[PDB]
Design an enzyme around this catalytic site. Structure first.
Site, PDB file in Angstrom:
ATOM      1  N   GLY A  46       0.839  -1.186   0.000  1.00 26.54           N
ATOM      2  CA  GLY A  46       0.000   0.000   0.000  1.00 26.54           C
ATOM      3  C   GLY A  46       0.870   1.230   0.000  1.00 26.54           C
ATOM      4  O   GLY A  46       2.095   1.114   0.085  1.00 26.54           O
ATOM      5  N   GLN A  51       3.214  10.084   1.920  1.00 30.44           N
ATOM      6  CA  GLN A  51       4.484   9.437   1.682  1.00 30.44           C
ATOM      7  C   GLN A  51       5.102   9.865   0.357  1.00 30.44           C
ATOM      8  O   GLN A  51       6.294   9.612   0.161  1.00 30.44           O
ATOM      9  CB  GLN A  51       4.318   7.919   1.699  1.00 30.44           C
ATOM     10  CG  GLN A  51       3.901   7.376   3.044  1.00 30.44           C
ATOM     11  CD  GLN A  51       3.827   5.883   3.011  1.00 30.44           C
ATOM     12  OE1 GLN A  51       2.822   5.329   2.587  1.00 30.44           O
ATOM     13  NE2 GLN A  51       4.939   5.208   3.367  1.00 30.44           N
ATOM     14  N   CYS A  98       7.717  -0.250   6.752  1.00 30.56           N
ATOM     15  CA  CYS A  98       7.138   0.947   6.109  1.00 30.56           C
ATOM     16  C   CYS A  98       8.117   1.519   5.140  1.00 30.56           C
ATOM     17  O   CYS A  98       9.320   1.638   5.457  1.00 30.56           O
ATOM     18  CB  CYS A  98       6.868   2.012   7.173  1.00 30.56           C
ATOM     19  SG  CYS A  98       6.079   3.551   6.649  1.00 30.56           S
ATOM     20  N   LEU A  99       7.619   1.988   3.991  1.00 30.10           N
ATOM     21  CA  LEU A  99       8.524   2.622   3.023  1.00 30.10           C
ATOM     22  C   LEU A  99       9.175   3.919   3.529  1.00 30.10           C
ATOM     23  O   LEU A  99      10.261   4.294   3.060  1.00 30.10           O
ATOM     24  CB  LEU A  99       7.781   2.874   1.686  1.00 30.10           C
ATOM     25  CG  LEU A  99       7.282   1.570   1.026  1.00 30.10           C
ATOM     26  CD1 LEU A  99       6.488   1.901  -0.214  1.00 30.10           C
ATOM     27  CD2 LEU A  99       8.435   0.667   0.660  1.00 30.10           C
ATOM     28  N   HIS A 140      -2.547   0.527   8.570  1.00 25.55           N
ATOM     29  CA  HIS A 140      -1.235   1.164   8.465  1.00 25.55           C
ATOM     30  C   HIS A 140      -1.350   2.373   7.581  1.00 25.55           C
ATOM     31  O   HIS A 140      -0.869   3.463   7.941  1.00 25.55           O
ATOM     32  CB  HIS A 140      -0.245   0.127   7.975  1.00 25.55           C
ATOM     33  CG  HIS A 140       1.136   0.650   7.680  1.00 25.55           C
ATOM     34  ND1 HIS A 140       2.218   0.174   8.323  1.00 25.55           N
ATOM     35  CD2 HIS A 140       1.600   1.546   6.726  1.00 25.55           C
ATOM     36  CE1 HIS A 140       3.328   0.791   7.841  1.00 25.55           C
ATOM     37  NE2 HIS A 140       2.957   1.626   6.871  1.00 25.55           N
ATOM     38  N   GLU A 141      -2.082   2.265   6.472  1.00 22.58           N
ATOM     39  CA  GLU A 141      -2.215   3.397   5.511  1.00 22.58           C
ATOM     40  C   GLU A 141      -3.093   4.519   6.142  1.00 22.58           C
ATOM     41  O   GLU A 141      -2.757   5.723   6.053  1.00 22.58           O
ATOM     42  CB  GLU A 141      -2.821   2.949   4.174  1.00 22.58           C
ATOM     43  CG  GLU A 141      -2.020   1.891   3.391  1.00 22.58           C
ATOM     44  CD  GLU A 141      -0.547   2.197   3.194  1.00 22.58           C
ATOM     45  OE1 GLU A 141      -0.152   3.385   3.256  1.00 22.58           O
ATOM     46  OE2 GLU A 141       0.217   1.212   3.018  1.00 22.58           O
ATOM     47  N   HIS A 144      -1.158   6.759   8.358  1.00 23.87           N
ATOM     48  CA  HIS A 144      -0.343   7.767   7.697  1.00 23.87           C
ATOM     49  C   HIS A 144      -1.150   9.027   7.409  1.00 23.87           C
ATOM     50  O   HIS A 144      -0.600  10.140   7.455  1.00 23.87           O
ATOM     51  CB  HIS A 144       0.191   7.261   6.363  1.00 23.87           C
ATOM     52  CG  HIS A 144       1.419   6.432   6.441  1.00 23.87           C
ATOM     53  ND1 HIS A 144       2.602   6.908   6.939  1.00 23.87           N
ATOM     54  CD2 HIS A 144       1.687   5.178   5.923  1.00 23.87           C
ATOM     55  CE1 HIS A 144       3.555   5.961   6.790  1.00 23.87           C
ATOM     56  NE2 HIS A 144       2.997   4.896   6.186  1.00 23.87           N
TER      57      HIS A 144
END
Ligand SMILES: CCCCC[C@H](CC(=O)NO)C(=O)N[C@H](C(=O)N1CCC[C@H]1CO)C(C)C
Ligand SMILES: CCCCC[C@H](CC(=O)NO)C(=O)N[C@H](C(=O)N1CCC[C@H]1CO)C(C)C
Ligand SMILES: [Cl-]
Ligand SMILES: [Cl-]
Ligand SMILES: [Cl-]
Ligand SMILES: [Zn+2]
Ligand SMILES: [Zn+2]
Lengths: 172, 172
Positions: A46, A51, A98-99, A140-141, A144
């Protein structure tokens, strides 16, 4: 459709809350397209708009195959202006990365199942009923979008260790 | 040599500091023997006396093969009255579990290398210079002697989740 640079900790953009999308128009669809490409280029499940430097309430997901009515996997999903409409009291511990915190993985406890109302790529109203890794990604998304990175759920000592790890890797 | 019952969270015995051993005599050797048997029966890398109900500063370790002067693995070690004499500033994240928190695993950040002075099975003075999993085990065991379980290093939310997990599994 282009690959956008990922914003990484401790960049303060990641701790800013994202704003509702007013209207799902051509410009939003273009951003969503770039988000899907960026997600794929980075081997992600995702990605949230913040981000890639855009503080709007937009996330994408695609969780590959590997409760009645809930999905364990799926996509591609374009999820705009998400609103949580149901959430399980039962929680599960799963490993996350996480990215925006590259290379750092840890365990997080979250609800197992979630239902979210959203607008899709066409601006149409939808609900997603997610469990397993699909629900995990979605939460998680959503975090953010609210200015939260998964390090928030860790001890201060481990959060600092993770941020120092990323800082050291990016020092010029 | 017999297999002793393991004390599990949230039993308050695990949060009590253990006392120095006055003299390494026959009774201590017998306990150490039972500790090694218990460790092996439970598939552990180490064990602290408090985990079998005895609040004395005694731990055992055996870390199988799978800095100059430091050992990555080894044993069997009988480590009585340990005193840390050197410890690395560099730290590493590794996954841990504990026999006193059965079934729960999480990530902990600890120094990579440690040197500890101790008395052995015969009451003789020794130093161990440990790194890798040997150092990791030794620190986990020393923490138990000080009344510390590895959940102490986690967020409160995850610590509580782990304790509730063990409590639910033990409810009669
Ligand atoms: C699992 C909850 C979040 C998934 C989304 C993230 C991507 C991201 O930072 N989105 O904001 C991801 O793909 N993370 C991956 C990840 O955490 N994975 C991929 C396989 C399973 C899990 C690691 O246990 C890797 C790329 C770090
Ligand atoms: C690693 C630091 C501590 C090791 C000692 C513990 C045993 C214990 O509770 N001692 O106090 C153990 O064997 N734990 C195991 C464990 O954590 N292991 C065994 C293989 C590697 C590591 C899991 O990553 C399992 C049995 C839970
Ligand atoms: Cl790490
Ligand atoms: Cl668990
Ligand atoms: Cl934690
Ligand atoms: Zn992320
Ligand atoms: Zn332990």
């Amino acid at each position: 459709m282009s690959v956008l640079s990922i914003v990484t900790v401790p960049d303060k953009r990641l701790s800013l809350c994202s704003e509702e999308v007013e209207k799902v128009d051509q410009s939003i669809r273009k951003l969503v397209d770039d988000m899907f490409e960026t997600m794929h280029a980075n081997q992600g499940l995702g990605l949230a708009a913040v981000q890639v430097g855009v503080h709007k309430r937009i996330l994408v997901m695609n969780v590959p195959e590997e409760i009645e009515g809930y999905e364990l996997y799926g996509g591609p999903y374009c999820i705009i202006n998400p609103k949580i409409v149901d959430i399980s009291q039962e929680k599960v511990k799963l490993k996350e990365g996480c990215l925006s915190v590259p290379g750092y993985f840890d365990y997080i406890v979250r609800p197992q199942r979630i239902a979210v109302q959203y607008l899709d790529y066409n601006g149409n109203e939808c609900i997603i009923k997610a469990q397993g890794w699909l629900a995990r990604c979605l939460q998680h998304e959503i975090d953010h979008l609210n200015g939260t990175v998964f390090l928030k759920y860790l001890s201060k000592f481990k959060r600092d260790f993770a941020i120092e790890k990323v800082k050291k890797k990016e020092r010029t």
